[PDB]
Design a protein around this ligand. Structure first.
Ligand SMILES: [Zn+2]
Ligand SMILES: [Zn+2]
Ligand SMILES: [Zn+2]
Ligand SMILES: [Zn+2]
Ligand SMILES: [Zn+2]
Ligand SMILES: [Zn+2]
Ligand SMILES: [Zn+2]
Ligand SMILES: [Zn+2]
Ligand SMILES: [Zn+2]
Ligand SMILES: [Zn+2]
Lengths: 42, 35, 42, 32, 42, 32
């Protein structure tokens, strides 16, 4: 059980890093779509 | 910036790279759980 | 250790809330790109 | 008529920042 | 705490599946915005 | 004009709905 808890903690730390990378991809998509709108309008 | 053609390609490529990094981290997380 | 279990539970609940926020951000990005398509086509 | 999907982009940005701060909280809990 | 640990593992495995789905949504969103740019330019 | 990316947007919608249902399942497992 102690080894299982260690593995869960390591897995959840790594999962949190994967979610941060997806969050950062989302920030780039906001910049992309804002750029499309600015081109269409200007 | 050039106002001639639309270019959001650098944002899209950065998003692709971040999604690839996420996929590798999810593989690492599942490998740790499987052990 | 029960304290480790409670910590992991609390961390995972909070992680699940973060993922839900990114999911909802994704929903908004779909609406934005559909808005661009509708603008161009109409 | 002007294209404007800024309401959706602003909501997306708010949601991404909410997620950032929740991930920091998860990491803090884990560190404990 | 064997049952608690099994519940955390099952919860985290499911959470990881959710994240992979959001990642795949993000890939489709990149294809969509690429498609908007290619339409506008080409 | 005939811009056509709705199938990518539909697939993204479907994947986000699949994620919503998986997150509900994860929370149910945690609560029990
Ligand atoms: Zn240990
Ligand atoms: Zn330990
Ligand atoms: Zn950037
Ligand atoms: Zn370029
Ligand atoms: Zn892959
Ligand atoms: Zn490996
Ligand atoms: Zn930030
Ligand atoms: Zn920050
Ligand atoms: Zn068991
Ligand atoms: Zn596809």
């Amino acid at each position: 059980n102690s080894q299982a808890i260690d593995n869960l903690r390591a897995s959840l730390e790594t999962t949190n890093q994967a979610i941060e990378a997806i969050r950062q991809a989302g920030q780039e998509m906001i910049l992309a779509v804002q750029g499309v709108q600015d081109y269409i309008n200007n | 910036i050039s106002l001639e053609r639309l270019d959001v390609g650098e944002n899209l490529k950065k998003a692709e790279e971040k999604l690839k990094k996420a996929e590798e981290l999810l593989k690492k997380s599942e490998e740790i759980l499987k052990k």
